[PDB]
A paper describes a structure:
ExoY virulence factors are members of a family of bacterial nucleotidyl cyclases (NCs) that are activated by specific eukaryotic cofactors and overproduce cyclic purine and pyrimidine nucleotides in host cells. Here, we explore the Vibrio nigripulchritudo Multifunctional-Autoprocessing Repeats-in-ToXin (MARTX) ExoY effector domain (Vn-ExoY) as a model for ExoY-type members that interact with monomeric (G-actin) instead of filamentous (F-actin) actin. While Pa-ExoY requires actin filaments (F-actin) for maximal activation, Vn-ExoY is selectively activated by G-actin in vitro.
To avoid the indirect effects of ATP depletion through Vn-ExoY AC activity, we used an inactive double mutant K528M/K535I, hereafter referred to as Vn-ExoYDM (corresponding to Pa-ExoYK81M/K88I). To improve the crystallisation strategy, we designed a chimeric protein containing three fused functional domains: Vn-ExoY extended at the C-terminus (Vn-ExoY455-896, either wild-type or with K528M/K535I), a short profilin-binding proline-rich motif (PRM) and profilin (VnE/VnEDM-PRM-Prof). Using this chimera (wild-type or double-mutant), we solved two crystal structures at 1.7 Å resolution: (i) VnEDM-PRM-Prof bound to actin-ADP with latrunculin B (LatB), and (ii) VnE-PRM-Prof bound to actin-ADP without LatB. In these structures, profilin is bound to actin-ADP, the PRM to profilin, Vn-ExoY to actin, while residues 863–895 connecting the C-terminus of Vn-ExoY to the PRM are disordered. The Vn-ExoY switch A disorder (residues 682–727) is close to the LatB-binding site in actin. (D) Structure of the nucleotide-free VnEDM-PRM-Prof chimera bound to actin-ADP-LatB.
Numbering used by the authors:
A (entry chain B): 466 to 685, 728 to 862, 895 to 1041
B (entry chain A): 5 to 43, 49 to 375
The structure:
Amino acid sequence: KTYQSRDLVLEPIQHPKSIELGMPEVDQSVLAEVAERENVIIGVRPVDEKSKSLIASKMYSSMGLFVKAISSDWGPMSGFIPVDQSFAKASARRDLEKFNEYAEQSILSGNAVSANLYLNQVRIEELVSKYESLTPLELDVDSGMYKTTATNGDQTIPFFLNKVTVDDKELWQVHYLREGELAPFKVIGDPVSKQPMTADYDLLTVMYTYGDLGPQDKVKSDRLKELKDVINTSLGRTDGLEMVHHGADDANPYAVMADNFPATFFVPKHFFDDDGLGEGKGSIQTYFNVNEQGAVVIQNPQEFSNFQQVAINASYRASLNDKWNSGLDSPLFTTKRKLSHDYLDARDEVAKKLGSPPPPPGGAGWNAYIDNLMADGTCQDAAIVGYKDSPSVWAAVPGKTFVNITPAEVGVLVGKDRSSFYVNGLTLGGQKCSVIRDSLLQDGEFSMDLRTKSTGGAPTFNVTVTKTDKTLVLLMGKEGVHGGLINKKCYEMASHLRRSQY
Amino acid sequence: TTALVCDNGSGLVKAGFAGDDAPRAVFPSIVGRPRHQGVQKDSYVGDEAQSKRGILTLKYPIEHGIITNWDDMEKIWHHTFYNELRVAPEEHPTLLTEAPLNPKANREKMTQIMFETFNVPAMYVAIQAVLSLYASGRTTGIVLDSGDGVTHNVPIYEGYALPHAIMRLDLAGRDLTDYLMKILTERGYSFVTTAEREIVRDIKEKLCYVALDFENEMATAASSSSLEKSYELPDGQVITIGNERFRCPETLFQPSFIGMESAGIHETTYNSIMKCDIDIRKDLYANNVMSGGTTMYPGIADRMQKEITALAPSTMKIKIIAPPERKYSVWIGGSILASLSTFQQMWITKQEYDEAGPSIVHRKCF
Ligand SMILES: C/C1=C/C(=O)O[C@@H]2C[C@@H](CC[C@H](C)/C=C\CC1)O[C@@](O)([C@@H]1CSC(=O)N1)C2
Ligand SMILES: Nc1ncnc2c1ncn2[C@@H]1O[C@H](COP(=O)(O)OP(=O)(O)O)[C@@H](O)[C@H]1O
Ligand SMILES: [Mg+2]
């Protein structure tokens, strides 16, 4: 039951635990269905747990692009981006001028509006009772509002909540003392819906099947834009209250492990079958924590790296056209570490699978020519054979194949017929060979390239034959020696012989 | 130092680095020059040539797998090195791919351009089908490579293509897109222009499939709507694609659909095997590898399995391999080959080129 592919070893999860996620499970089910229908793997950055009810209410808009003012983690504005950044997280409170300018510029550039903040009864109960973020509400008889303070952030600031009816909903409007006077609390809202922005569903990565990879149809990412539209359509929010936004903000020089994990991944349903990670290899839920809604929960960088490898192995990859930040505190995120196992296995397989004689010019024996051909250690056999009149081996490596070449075999090599040897090859010293290239009649080559034929898994070897005015120069490489190296060597010796009228 | 891998496709250039599992760049094999020849750039390549199509004349320099315009091909290589990969070619050994049966004069010209124009330190030219066989983890087998402008059956023995037995079919993805435009136009729609060809190429890639039994599927399409799929056109109109889903790739098996008198891909596979030594034929039947974009149709491997089985001796063991990454297997095979230690012994060095000239490619590359 253990998953094994090269250096990737995954052991079954003993006692699967339930992991808390910020994304409402109704939307997790939607994203699981989108991954199946679209045949893609979608990764979504964690949503802050405390913002779940805000998203579940389906009343708000979500964080769009070009908003550099940050959210608050305290008071009744928790989970929203206050226009007055003194009400935001500690990093904004200690850099007021910088953050207040970001909020103001977001409005001035048409990227946000200043909106009123209404909270539902669920939110008031969460802040008072579940999280104890606010002190119990106390009716202030003069204004008719309920006063409360935050139990974190600045505990000296009073907030005032007023019961209002907004489009048939009984909500609580947030008010505060602005320059000492009661005023409606303002948050950054979306420019088209005018509704406050909560956290959005920030896509971490999208991995597509091979068929969906390739050049774009941009006649000036379209696939990612199209997928985001399918997601928003399937999420079914009112127009203007979308959870996913087209485009993406800068990578940002920040880390925080809570901003990247636990990430929720959504995958095609075939990953959940018994042969999910391959024939008899097990289902993805055996090695990764998957909930009832089909969300694959990735808790840390090692799990993210392992999940990415399983997806890559299953032929799902991030696009060339798409831009992702995905990683953060990288264990082995380089391209060289995430290579497909089909690529590495094929490379390993290929590396394994690839492995009266006249006096010679000078007058000092033909054996010196054989010694020359055998010197660089690339060849196991070499021969110089006269082919005119009665053919004979002038010189050859003793105890090898070429020394036994016959006149019948020479006749096939130099014969007029250049097609019968394609039926089942030819022999050289009795050794069966296949013809790879017959360039015997090509000017400037006068050569034939062959490869021996053998039984089972016994090695085979490349052979080149080059024809001169009176001789055939034959060479056989050792195991693994490329045919081009042998052809070049045979060509060079043949040229030398042709220069001396041989 | 990293070797570069450039797959010079009839429709798409796939380029990248050896040792990577996918190309870094995939772009159209087109060059665009301003329409008025008798006259702020002299020429445009790929994506940019398509974006500025309103002011340029577009041409495919490798229309049918064979390079015909060397000036436009040099622009493609320059774009690939400098603009897509952002490398200095003189610093990298470069593996180029070539069509099966590429003319000697063509591979000589490609070698000369690499060394004389780009000054690469070393280069090699590999047959595309051989690289796809390597990407499947094999050295012996028969590859059916169907791309944009050309289709070939390539039998291979231990890494060496057997040119006497290579079969070429002058029909590929581009012809299938043209045929789909014709049969949709027959229904009252109009798909005629270059831009409409691109819409139909999208329809073809998203909805077409190979039927296991064509006549049975034609009968089903005429008796029910179970095979119909809807496609939204750029103008908002919706078109229903029915029997066109499988009539379009049926042309691979029946080239008479487009007026061609050629045998189908199953018949050319048999013919190609039969042109090889008797001794290797069992190994070829058991190792049929599908490669190229035009082999992506769902159902194509099961149809090839049925068709080859019907042709071959009944005891023949037949196996069709259609990798999920087969659109890029030529490139992937080149990355495998150029990342192996045996590759340094195979490349043609500048020293070897200086000594022998362009004809060195005949000796070293096969
Ligand atoms: C997305 C894409 C795919 C492709 O395969 O593109 C290649 C290259 C392309 C060049 C012209 C085109 C207008 C430009 C870009 C399209 C690139 O032509 C093709 O689309 C041709 C024409 S229709 C067909 O099936 N092949 C194939
Ligand atoms: N999913 C698919 N279904 C059918 N045809 C496809 C698919 N994907 C790509 N193609 C087609 O494959 C061709 C491009 O394939 P490729 O092997 O890159 O060609 P080349 O190497 O000749 O440039 C085009 O005709 C394209 O429409
Ligand atoms: Mg190709």
